Amino acid sequence: LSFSPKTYSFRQDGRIKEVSVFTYHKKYNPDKHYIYVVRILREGQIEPSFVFRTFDEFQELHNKLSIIFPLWKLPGFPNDVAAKRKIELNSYLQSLMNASTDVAECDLVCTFFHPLLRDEK
Amino acid sequence: LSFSPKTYSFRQDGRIKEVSVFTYHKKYNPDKHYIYVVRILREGQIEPSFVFRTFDEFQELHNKLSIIFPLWKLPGFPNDVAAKRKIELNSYLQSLMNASTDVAECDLVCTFFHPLLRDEK
Amino acid sequence: LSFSPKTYSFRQDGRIKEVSVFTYHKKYNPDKHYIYVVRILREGQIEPSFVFRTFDEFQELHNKLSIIFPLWKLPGFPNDVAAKRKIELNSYLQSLMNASTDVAECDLVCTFFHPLLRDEK
Amino acid sequence: LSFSPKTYSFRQDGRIKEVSVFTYHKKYNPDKHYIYVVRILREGQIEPSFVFRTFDEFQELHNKLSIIFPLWKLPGFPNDVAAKRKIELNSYLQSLMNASTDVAECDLVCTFFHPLLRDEK
Numbered sequence A, B, C, D: 001l002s003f004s005p006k007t008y009s010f011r012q013d014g015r016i017k018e019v020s021v022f023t024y025h026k027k028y029n030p031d032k033h034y035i036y037v038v039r040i041l042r043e044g045q046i047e048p049s050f051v052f053r054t055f056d057e058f059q060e061l062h063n064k065l066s067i068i069f070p071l072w073k074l075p076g077f078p079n080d081v082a083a084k085r086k087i088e089l090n091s092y093l094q095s096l097m098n099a100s101t102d103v104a105e106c107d108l109v110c111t112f113f114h115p116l117l118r119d120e121k
Helices: A055-068 A084-098 A108-114 B053-069 B082-099 B107-113 C055-068 C085-098 C109-111 D055-068 D084-097 D109-111
Strands: A017-024 A032-043 A049-053 B018-026 B034-042 B049-053 C016-026 C034-042 C049-053 D016-026 D034-042 D049-053
Touching: A017 A084, A032 A055, A032 A084, A032 C055, B018 B082, B034 B053, B034 B082, B053 B082, B053 B107, B107 C085, C034 C055, C034 C085, C034 C109, C055 C085, C055 C109, D016 D084, D034 D055, D034 D084, D055 D084, D055 D109
Parallel strands: none
Antiparallel strands: A017 A032, A032 A049, B018 B034, B034 B049, C016 C034, C034 C049, D016 D034, D034 D049
16 A cells, blocks of 8 residues: 555454545645545444545555455445545445455555544544 | 524533434525425434524534534535435535534534524424 | 225324335226335334335325425425336335324324225235 | 256245345456346355346346236336446345345245355355
8 A cells, every 4th residue: 555654454453333435625735636534433432533535545445455356356446526436435435344354354444544644633 | 603592502402313304395585495494303302303494504504614623524515406405405414413523513513403483383 | 085985093003114115016907007016014013014006196195294284394295217206205205204203193194004905915 | 047056945045134236247258248246144144245146147036036926026127337237236136125025035036145156256
């Protein structure tokens, strides 16, 4: 993953009970672009947390998973009013959680959810 | 909030277990317009209650929240057959309940749900 | 109700836990028309039961309810590929169950669900 | 069923708690075509399993059921971007599980879900 330094695992981080794309948010620097606010609720938590991920960051995850896993183990990835990416990335995440455990709980997926730089509110 | 005198808080009013937009209803005075019937179920209640809110009243809530909260903490607000406002206001409410607790349980949101003038069946 | 002789009440019949429109089915006599197969699961039952209702029969129910109840207490009623009536009648039923108890459990609604002539498989 | 040798029954195989179409997957031999990855969770299982079924294989199931069962006991069957078959086959499966028990738990349905040749990962 080209956006997280360390690699993390659901061991240290906590399993995911709920995820979704909560909203999308407009940026400025370094160029105009939408970023997706991802809502995560872990096991044992009542307050959700939120991380920030661009479309090109969702895509990288799916491309990296697809190196490790046969495609049939992965949900379809989708190819502004084009906040249909919000709905589509949401489906993508929901399906990801319903994939066999070797995918849903692998270290890439965990790392994708680990709070970064930006995510420190 | 330009439509409720007092300000209320989930302290005195009771936490929300379920909300949605139940239907929309056609008015007359002082001018033709649709009003949204919002269905609320509190904790400890089995019978829901219903309040009446216009689109311009949902909008004010979102604008007032957006003064207090960074935008990324809030769900997207949407810009008759145009009862797509019903579906859209419904999503908006569902997302609002899934926002971090400092938004979902703030006094504005509580006040928006407090029964007014009209709401006394 | 112009299609059930007696009037029935959730007293004698059993409360509804689940309803939906399950499929729609093509008829012949006395003229070509679609009829809706409504799936009902009562409290205390594990096997659902099924009754048969035409669109004009859903409509009558809504019109009769609207004599008794102010409109804001009722879900919107919708104005073949036109099996969007299935999706729409389904929403209508789901909302009906979420209406205040004086509507959701009134004798008209109960009677609408009581097995008729046709419904004896 | 023209694609499973033996016939199986939920007796030996285990009842279904969750099914859905998880993704669709592109094939090559013997000709270009999409195949549907069906996600099944049995009672007593936490890890789902996955079988592979073409559209013409879903259709055969529905046609064979329709020999045994009156049509009103069956959900509507639907008549690439045409991965609307995924959404549509998914609805079809969800409805199938909600059909009366004599359909939802018959040996054809069970057999449709029994892991074949291909399904051995």
